[PDB]
């Protein structure tokens, strides 16, 4: 029809890929790129289910759908097909996680210049607020509860390859690698999955300061003022 | 040349104060400035962990090892192996760990912990290094993006399967840096540098204690995009 | 039937109202309103044409396209239909200008769960050898990029203490101290600096050679060959 | 004449610190440089030195015949090797650009103190040490290559004065004692000294 089946059908897998915690590129959104992703959710029936739950979202969350394991399950294998990575990466953790992102983006008027803000706070569990502190001593007591699975006493020594034709030809692999794209994606990848730990154990966290504190103590003790 | 000689003359007399030096100073900061020795560093400490990983008799890729939920096994070595090389690195003179240590490796929401996958504790004189399944395989299965965005502002080894290699790397040094805390001081310390992280500017810097080392994030300053 | 098309009609009314008498008001809407607007325009057989037309008004506005006057007519009476207003102040000029205000409305960027912003510093190492002129120039082009500050220009004769009694202590004190050591060790300052600074930028400098053209020519054109 | 030219060298040397006293400036010259936020006690200090340079090479004249300005970096990307004196003019004024950390740098080089070449009254007074008169000496003899660079910019052009930032044999164009160019031991032709390189 009218529609690009292909052209909107990648945006949306775009806007998936990024909404739901999922990739790590970053690419400048607008708003008819939103728009086209909606609307081809609208086109195809099997991804009506996300279409109305977005539906119901746009107006506020006083109400979410009730549904039985026979919708859920149809739903996530929507969301595998649509995302075409391992089914089981994302369950009702990530269902939720894009409810709460889609929600919190159709809300609030546009802004000249994005928003840049995270979607952990008000997004799961409104019954309360909990201290983090109270929550790390009472699951540590669950942790160390029982079943520690192996003795290791006297210790392996490390193996080592002083042959250097091997390290020279992983060397010669590692070339067409570049180190700053990777480590930009490991410390990327560990940030958000991260915060998705921080979202979803619904323990508030310094967004601003306790990381950034890590990473600025470290390299300043690392250089200046070291004494 | 070996030798740089200068001399400081006089008008109306010979007498001069005539100094020697060497070009020791001047070519080592021209090479250890330089990029180059530096990325060479780092793809050296990749290389070795990497054939550390090989020579573990472990044949099966990174991930592959973390998908398997029922022998955890496998990932307590890794993780330990790991521990042993940051061990190694900021301790050359020590290779082995002379404190049997046991896993206890979950797979539930609330052994999770929201920021130290790999909480490392000591229960009556045994050590206790937590494994948690869930956040370590929601790292691992993030897709790193691959086309050329660099923004500089033979083998069966790929861009993204060694990124997830250098994230677990990362992820063992700040388990690392918060043991290396546990055992320098009382569990007190411990607790509160898992709270404040603020330990970091006590007993780390470059000395007998502390060795440098590079703990490689030295090498790529990052920071938040906050406002 | 799953659509409610009398709400998003409402909406629909109100947004069409302000981008067609070209009041943006950012402020007025959201994204919520521009998707229920879209869907209803496209639920109709009526307004898949306002809906191809559009298409095209997401991303490439310099492409007019190319249609004659009947399809324009067909399309100014589905734009009377919408607006429900008498065509006395509609015309193609305005649909035009709304057009363009739903385009600049659509590639407004709206929000991002941030980033980590791993651009920072690099050095700049060449890795390679490096000349004098190429460095001067490339340099001196970031050298005066901006921030003025010093503002000492007014032009005054320097101060001067001109009682003999504070010279004559100094002078008396300075009796004791040698000319050729301090010679010697500012000499000796100037070259270790310098040799630090090309170290430090890799710059293929005359090992003892351009400092000696300093030193050798000066000294000696000034004591003869005097012209 | 070896003691004429000692007094007069030290006399001059008492006249830069005479005249860096009258500057008025109360944080000391280690921690003049030393403080990256302040950049106008730095600059009042470059702007002096390069005031005394050009009245003690042309005496005659006294008011400034220029307007100048200075920008301060504190990076290695700007930081030219060899020159932290940065010197040029930009739409009718001069720019006296510093690059701070390779003057901290120099001014704190574990300056020698031993002498190797082998060989009522008194009280509370004005003290000086070795490091002092050596960094002044120092801090003198690089404003001086900066004026050397400037008199050729301005006896010459700027495509001369950029060819002489190649070179430096310019130098000898002109400085010499001259009825126009006054004389003058210009501070380091009180010595020669060269390099034992092999």
């Known amino acids: 029809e009218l529609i690009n089946m292909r052209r909107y059908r990648n945006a949306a897998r775009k806007l998936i890929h990024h909404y739901s915690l999922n990739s790590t590129s970053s690419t400048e959104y607008k708003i008819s790129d939103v728009v086209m992703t909606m609307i081809f959710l609208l086109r195809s029936e099997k991804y009506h289910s996300l279409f109305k739950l977005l539906e119901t979202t746009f107006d506020d969350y006083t109400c979410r759908p009730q549904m039985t394991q026979v919708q859920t399950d149809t739903l996530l294998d929507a969301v595998r097909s649509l995302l075409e990575m391992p089914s089981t990466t994302i369950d009702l953790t990530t269902v939720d996680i894009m409810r709460s992102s889609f929600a919190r983006c159709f809300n609030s008027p546009i802004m000249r210049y994005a928003k840049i803000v995270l979607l952990q706070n008000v997004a799961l569990q409104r019954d309360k607020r909990t201290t983090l502190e109270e929550l790390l001593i009472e699951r540590g007591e669950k942790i160390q509860m029982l079943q520690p699975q192996q003795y290791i006493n006297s210790g392996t020594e490390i193996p080592f390859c002083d042959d250097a034709e091997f390290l020279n030809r992983l060397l010669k692999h590692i070339d067409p690698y570049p180190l700053s794209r990777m480590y930009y994606n490991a410390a990327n990848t560990m940030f958000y999955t991260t915060m998705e730990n921080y979202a979803v154990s619904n323990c508030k966290f310094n967004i601003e300061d306790y990381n950034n504190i890590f990473k600025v103590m470290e390299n300043i003790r690392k250089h200046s003022n070291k004494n | ?227």
């Open chain 2, 1 to 227: 040349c070996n030798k740089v000689r200068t001399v400081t003359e006089i008008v109306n007399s010979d007498e001069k104060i005539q100094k020697t030096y060497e070009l020791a100073e001047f070519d080592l900061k021209n090479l250890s400035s330089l990029e180059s020795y530096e990325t060479l560093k780092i793809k050296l400490a990749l290389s070795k962990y990497m054939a550390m990983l090989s020579t573990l008799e472990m044949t099966q890729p990174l991930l592959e090892i973390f998908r398997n939920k029922a022998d955890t096994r496998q990932i307590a070595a890794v993780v330990f192996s790991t521990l042993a090389f940051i061990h190694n690195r900021f301790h050359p003179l020590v290779t082995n760990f002379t404190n049997k240590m046991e896993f206890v490796v979950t797979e539930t929401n609330d052994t999770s912990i929201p920021g130290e996958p790999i909480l490392f504790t000591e229960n009556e004189g045994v050590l206790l290094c937590s494994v948690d399944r869930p956040s370590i395989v929601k790292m691992l299965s993030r897709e790193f993006d691959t086309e050329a965005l660099v923004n500089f502002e033979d083998f069966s080894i790929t861009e993204v399967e060694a990124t997830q290699y250098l994230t677990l790397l990362l992820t063992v040094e700040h388990a690392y840096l918060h043991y290396y805390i546990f055992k320098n001081y009382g569990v007190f310390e411990y607790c509160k540098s898992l709270t404040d992280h603020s330990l970091f500017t006590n007993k780390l810097r470059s000395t007998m204690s502390t060795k440098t080392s590079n703990l490689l994030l030295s090498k790529f300053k990052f920071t938040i995009e906050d406002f």
